[PDB]
């Protein structure tokens, strides 16, 4: 068959979000609130293209919008967030329920200094509508022409010509 078409190594270079998983999980609800739009454009492009190579640029927007999410935490509320992801980082299963006072301090400092509302129980699992200008992929499976089906039956059913025609049976 054909050559697989991969992007080059310079096409994949982007400033990564070089933080740990507890830093991400501690900031997760405000990330799902504030970084909604490029993330949903990316995941819509990701389920519609069904090909990561056609989803790189939108993905870079994700990696553009996450970092600006953290710098805006780093410029204003670096220390309550630092205590909060440290307390999240202690636990094995990384429980939100073991760290409610640092969560309250972080949410209070964020709501005062930046004006972000933490999403409630039920909001981040909603299915939202996304306004994009990219075209809908007309063939995301790279399929081809389906074969022509067999012709159907039509016409009124006439009786059998001279019956069964089985050797001598005249009916």
């Amino acid at each position: 068959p054909g050559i697989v078409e991969l992007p080059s190594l310079e096409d994949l270079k982007v400033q990564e979000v070089k933080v740990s998983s507890s830093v991400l999980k501690a900031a997760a609800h405000h990330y799902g609130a504030q970084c909604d739009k490029p993330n949903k454009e990316f995941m819509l492009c990701r389920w519609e293209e069904k090909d990561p190579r056609r989803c790189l640029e939108e993905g870079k927007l994700v990696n553009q919008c996450a970092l600006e999410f953290f710098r805006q935490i780093k410029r204003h509320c670096a220390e309550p967030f630092t205590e909060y992801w440290t307390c999240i980082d202690y636990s094995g299963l990384q429980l939100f329920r073991r760290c409610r006072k640092e969560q309250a301090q972080f949410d209070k400092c964020v709501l005062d200094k930046l004006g972000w509302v933490r999403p409630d129980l039920g909001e981040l699992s909603k299915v939202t509508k996304v306004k994009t200008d990219r075209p809908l992929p007309e063939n995301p499976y790279h399929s081809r022409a389906r074969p022509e089906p067999n012709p159907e039956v039509e016409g009124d059913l006439k009786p059998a010509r001279h019956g069964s025609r089985l050797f001598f049976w005249t009916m």
Partner: protein, 63 residues
């Protein structure tokens, strides 16, 4: 019976039986072509229904 009666009755018998014989030869040729090509209503052995396929958005996108 009259010779006219037997004669024309024999012609009716020969019409019916020659038509049955030509239809049997056509039936054999139709069966041969439908088994060879598979494009007729006979020998349509079952394949999988595509109404069974789930086209919902799945868990991972690459599918």
């Amino acid at each position: 019976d009259a010779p006219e009666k037997n004669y024309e009755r024999t012609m009716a018998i020969l019409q019916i039986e020659s038509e049955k014989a030509e239809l049997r030869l056509k039936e054999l040729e139709v069966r041969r072509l439908m088994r060879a090509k598979g494009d007729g209503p006979w020998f349509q052995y079952p394949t999988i229904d595509k109404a069974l396929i789930d086209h919902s958005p799945k868990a991972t996108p690459d599918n």
